[PDB]
C-alpha cells in the first residue's frame, strides 16, 4: 500500500487538474485528454522508471502487459460527455503486476468520487465498502446499453431481443462509470461491442471484488493485452445473457468480431 | 399569485425531504406517502384546485379550468427500486389552461428546477442561461434503446441516432427534459408520455427558448398523453423538418394505435 497510496493520490490530482483547466477556459477536450496523461505518465515514470504505462494518448503501444508493473490509463473516458456535459467523465487506471492484476481505480471527476479496489480487500465508492452482488433475472435487470449498437446490421437483432426483455435500458457514455455502476448495483449488465483495455481496466478489477463478471459477448475471457468486446453483468444474468441470447448466435458473432 | 408559487416550491422540497426519511427509515409505499402528502397539503390548503395525476388522478378532468397540479410524485420509479438515485417529483401548474410554474426536484441530489412563466428558470438560486442552437450532427440525444426496437418506428429513429454525435438513456423523462433545459442534452424523444411526465419540465424548458412537441410537430397539452420532441430550436427544427415531418404519415399510424 505504497504503490496503492501513490495511484490513489495521483488519480485524485490528475481530477482536480482537469478541474482546474476547464475552469480556466473541441480543441479543448483535445489538450487536457494529452496534457493529463502527460502529467499521469511524468509523475509514474519520475519515481517508479521501470513501471511501464499504456494509455489511450499512445503511451505504450504494443507493450508486453504481463512483465512487470503495468499501469494502463484512459485519462478521460467520456470525451463527449466531457465537451458537452462538463460531467459524468472519469479517469480509469487498472494497475497490473506480472499480467496479474493489483489494483483498479475509476474517478468520477466532477462528482468528485472515486471508486477503487486492491485486489483481496473489496471494493470501494469513496469510503464506503461495495456490498457483493445479487444475482438477477434479465427480466428484472436494468441494461447499460447504447442506442447506435441497435442501428447496426446483425448485432442490432441479437440487441433488440434483449433489449425487449431487459426491465428498461440506459446509456451513460462511459464505459469505465458503467462497469463501475454494475458493480454499485446500480446497474444489472452493461455490453457493447468494442472497446480498449484502458476503457476495462480500472474497473474490472473493482467488479471482480463484488464478484461480479466480465466476458466478451462470446463468453471469452478480457485480458489488458488488446481491444474486445464486453458483457458485464452480476453472475445470474450475465449467465443468462449469453446462454440464451448470445451464444445461440455465436456464428453471426465470431464473424462481426473476426472483421472487428 | 406569489403566495402559489412559494407554497408549491415549499412543498415539493418537502415531499422530497419526507422521502429521504421513509428511505432511512429502512417504494410502493414511499410513492403513496408521496402522492397523499403532496395532494392532501394542496388541497387543505387550496380546495378549490385541481389534480391530475397517476393511477386516474384527475382523470377527464377539464384542464382548462382553475387551478390545475400536474403532479408525478416519483418519476423514474425504475431507477428508484435498483438505483435509490436518479429519481424526480415534478410538479406543473396550470392556471386557466395556461402553464404558471414548473417544478422539478432531483431528491438525492438536492437540486431544485424550478421555473415561473416570463421568470427565467433555476437551478437553485442560479439562473439557467438560454439554449444555443445545435445541429443534429453535433449534438447529443436522449432516446431509450426500447424505441429502436420497434419495426416502423425504430426505422425512424435510427435515422436520427445515426445522425446525432450520440445518444443517451437516464430513465427518467422529468430529469431528461431538464437535461435539455441545462445544455446537457440538445434534445430527447419518446413516442409516448403522460401530461405528469412533462408538466413541469415544460416550464423550465420555454424559460430557456427550449422547444417541445411531439413527433409530428404540434404542441403538447396537458390533455392527453402524446409523443415527446424535446430541444434547442435550431435541431428540433433540424429533427422535425428533416427526419420526423417527411414521414408525418407513417407516424399518424403509429400514434393512432398507440392511443
Ligand atoms: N472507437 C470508439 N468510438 C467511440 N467510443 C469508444 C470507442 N472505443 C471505446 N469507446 C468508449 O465507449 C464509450 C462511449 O460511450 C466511452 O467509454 C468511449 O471512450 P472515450 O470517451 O475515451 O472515447
Ligand atoms: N407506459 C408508459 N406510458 C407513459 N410513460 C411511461 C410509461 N412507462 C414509463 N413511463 C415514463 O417514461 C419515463 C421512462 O420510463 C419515466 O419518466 C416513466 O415514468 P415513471 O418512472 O413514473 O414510471
Ligand atoms: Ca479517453
Ligand atoms: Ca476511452
Ligand atoms: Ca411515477
Ligand atoms: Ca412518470
Known sequence: MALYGFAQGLIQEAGIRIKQLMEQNNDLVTNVDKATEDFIFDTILETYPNHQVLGEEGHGHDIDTSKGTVWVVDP????????????????????????????????????????????????????????????????????????????????????????????????????????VSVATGNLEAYMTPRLQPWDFAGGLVILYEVNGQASNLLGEPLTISGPNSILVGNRGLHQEISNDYLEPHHDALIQLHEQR
Open 76 to 179: 478521460i473516458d467520456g470525451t463527449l460527455n466531457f465537451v458537452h456535459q462538463q460531467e459524468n467523465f472519469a479517469i480509469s487506471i487498472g494497475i497490473y503486476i506480472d499480467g496479474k492484476p493489483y489494483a483498479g481505480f475509476v474517478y468520477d471527476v466532477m462528482a468528485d468520487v472515486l471508486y477503487h479496489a486492491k485486489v483481496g480487500e473489496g471494493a470501494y465508492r469513496g469510503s464506503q465498502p461495495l456490498k457483493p452482488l445479487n444475482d438477477s433475472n434479465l427480466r428484472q435487470s436494468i441494461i447499460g446499453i447504447n442506442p447506435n449498437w441497435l442501428t447496426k446490421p446483425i448485432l442490432g437483432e441479437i440487441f433488440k431481443e434483449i433489449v425487449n426483455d431487459s426491465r428498461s435500458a440506459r446509456a451513460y457514455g462511459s464505459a469505465a462509470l458503467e462497469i
